Amino acid sequence: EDYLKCLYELGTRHNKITNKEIAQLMQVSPPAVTEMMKKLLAEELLIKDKKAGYLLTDLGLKLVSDLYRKHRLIEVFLVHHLGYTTEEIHEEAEVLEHTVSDHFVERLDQLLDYPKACPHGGTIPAKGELLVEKHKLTLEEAKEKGDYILARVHDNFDLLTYLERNGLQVGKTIRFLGYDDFSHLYSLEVDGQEIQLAQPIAQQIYVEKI
Amino acid sequence: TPNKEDYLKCLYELGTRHNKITNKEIAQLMQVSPPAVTEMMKKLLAEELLIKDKKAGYLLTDLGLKLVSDLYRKHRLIEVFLVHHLGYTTEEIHEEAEVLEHTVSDHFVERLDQLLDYPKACPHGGTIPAKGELLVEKHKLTLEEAKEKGDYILARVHDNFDLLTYLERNGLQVGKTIRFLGYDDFSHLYSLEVDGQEIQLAQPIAQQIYVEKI
């Protein structure tokens, strides 16, 4: 089931679905690929698309959406209220995230007064609603130059470490200096200083003109 | 399921009633296989959490008490968090508390403590020791070992889910005022006046309710 989680992620790139990208980004061999996908298909969790490889059904998106909700509220609580840092969230986040009941999570929602986002720009779906991200415009995706706002980062620890090591906080203003067509590099002007971002990193940051 | 922490808690409370400590009793309280007991104590001895002793069976070491204390911190701060912040009910707490206790880290518990603004007691009157300080209950005086008659505060009750259910089902609650009418010497009962209404507790229950003469 932990598989559904990766399916939705790559889905936000619009590529294809490889039984080779499955065994790879999950570190488990293809004898479990064919047996995971079958369970999924017969429990109406996904359908096979020729073009996209695999698509999640509404049932699957509601499932995956609930997962993100649980994960994002917990983030808010640990960051905002237990003063956890990126490193600390790296250690304990996912365990209690995988233990707390739906009840806990409902109540956490009230205690935090129904926050609309996690500290990283992520959007928090209502119970049993669907996950629709407020900020979807990756740096890569953006055409025009000028001053932008860093509105969301992928949640990954390695990424955050990267970003903080480099001074890019969700909410911080950022001026886009352009994508070099050969260099494969994006140029930013944050805090009056220049930074060079690779492609893989620029496709995991979401901005907004303003 | 039962880890060494669940044993130390047991043994710990099993000695607030300063008798020996059979393994029969440990097997009884823990609901386990006697060879499992024999196996756990071995480990508990080896970790220098307790030592054997003639009159008491086992005594806890400073390292032991220091651990017991953590257990009680974790358990009572989670208790305080669940009911005050998330509005948990007795039943809810019974269904959920234990797995969180067996899961959250000591760093969670430390941050939690700060979030809760350093509560010196959980909602059932159980006291909440500081990181590293030793469990020393604010309320030791039990109903059964209560001398004088008259008015009393119901200061603490044991966490026990069946006990709580019994108490809510007889409107006994930490905080309410209580008229002790004494032990009836043969009745084998304790008489209380809770909300002007009379009520009779047996020894095993009076033993679990803690009061302070107001």
Domains of chain A and any CATH numbers: 1-134 (1.10.10.10), 135-210 (2.30.30.90)
The nearest alpha carbon in chain B to A109 belongs to: B86
Instruction: Collect all residues of chain B within an 8 Å Cβ-Cβ radius of residue A110.
Output: 86
Torsion of CA A187, A192, A193, A194, to 10 degrees: 10
Instruction: Collect all residues of chain B within an 8 Å Cβ-Cβ radius of residue A101.
Output: 95-96
Give the number of C-alpha atoms closer than 13 A to the C-alpha of residue A150, restricted to the C-beta side: 24
The number of C-beta contacts closer than 8 angstroms across A and B is 38
The continuous run of DSSP H or E covering B178 comes out as strand B177-184
Angle, to 10 degrees, between the axis of helix A86-97 and the axis of helix A157-165? 160
Which residue, among B103, B106, B114, would best test binding to A if mutated, counting the most A CBs under 10 Å from its CB?
Answer: B103
Among A82, A101, A110, select the one facing B108 at the smallest CB separation: A82
Contact A119, A76 (CB under 8 A): yes
Which of B121, B123, B36 has the alpha carbon at shortest distance from B86?
B123
Which of B89, B74, B77 has the alpha carbon at shortest distance from B165?
B89
Length of chain A: 210
Contact B122, B79 (CB under 8 A): yes
- Residues from B in contact with A at Cβ < 8 Å: 85-88, 92, 95-96, 99-100, 103-105, 107-108, 111-112, 114-115
Q: Which residues share a beta bridge with A86? A: none
A120 is annotated as contributing to ligand binding: yes
Residue found by looking up tokens 């059904």 in the block? A57
* Cβ-Cβ contacts under 8 Å for B86 (sequence gap 6 or more): A104, A107, A108, A110, A111
Among B96, B105, B108, select the one facing A104 at the smallest CB separation: B96
Residue found by looking up tokens 């039962």 in the block? B2
**Which amino acid is present at A141?**
E
Instruction: Collect all residues of chain B within an 8 Å Cβ-Cβ radius of residue A81.
Output: 115
- Retrieve residue B187's tokens: 């009745």
CB contact under 8 A, B99 and A96: no
The rounded distance, in Å, linking the Cα atoms of B98 and B75 is 8
CB contact under 8 A, A92 and B107: yes
The rounded distance, in Å, linking the Cα atoms of B121 and B75 is 11
Provide the 8-state DSSP code for A81: I
- Retrieve residue B197's tokens: 């209404």
CB contact under 8 A, A92 and B99: no
- A69 vs chain B: nearest CA distance in angstroms? 17
Q: How many beta carbons lie within 10 A of that of residue B194, not counting itself?
A: 17
Q: Which residues share a beta bridge with A176? A: A146, A188
**Which amino acid is present at A103?**
H
- A107 vs chain B: nearest CA distance in angstroms? 5
Q: How many beta carbons lie within 10 A of that of residue A147, not counting itself?
A: 12
Alpha helices in A112-192 (DSSP H): 157-165
Q: What separation in angstroms does the CA of A20 have from each of A30, A57, A178, B24, B166?
A: 8, 22, 34, 57, 59
| Burial of residue A197 (number of CB atoms within 10 Å: 0-12, 13-18, 19+) | buried
The rounded distance, in Å, linking the Cα atoms of B151 and B179 is 4
- B58 vs chain A: nearest CA distance in angstroms? 35
The rounded distance, in Å, linking the Cα atoms of B12 and B68 is 7
The helix/strand/coil state of B39 is helix
B102 is annotated as contributing to ligand binding: no
The nearest alpha carbon in chain B to A88 belongs to: B107
**Which amino acid is present at B93?**
I
The rounded distance, in Å, linking the Cα atoms of A121 and A133 is 9
CB contact under 8 A, B86 and A107: yes
Which residue, among B81, B86, B92, B101, would best test binding to A if mutated, counting the most A CBs under 10 Å from its CB?
Answer: B86
Instruction: Collect all residues of chain B within an 8 Å Cβ-Cβ radius of residue A111.
Output: 85-86
Which of A13, A5, A206 has the alpha carbon at shortest distance from A117?
A206
Residue found by looking up tokens 């043969």 in the block? B186
Task: Tell me the structure's resolution in angstroms, rounded to a single decimal.
Answer: 2.7
The nearest alpha carbon in chain B to A80 belongs to: B115
The nearest alpha carbon in chain A to B86 belongs to: A107
Residue found by looking up tokens 């409902």 in the block? A106
Among A92, A104, A111, select the one facing B105 at the smallest CB separation: A92
Among B86, B108, B112, select the one facing A108 at the smallest CB separation: B86
Which of B191, B199, B198, B183 has the alpha carbon at shortest distance from B147?
B183
Contacts 24+ apart (CB under 8 A), B106-110: B106/B70, B106/B74, B107/A88, B107/A92, B108/A82, B108/A92, B108/A96, B109/B70, B109/B73, B109/B74, B109/B77, B109/B78
Which experiment gave this structure?
A: X-ray
Among A81, A88, A104, select the one facing B107 at the smallest CB separation: A88
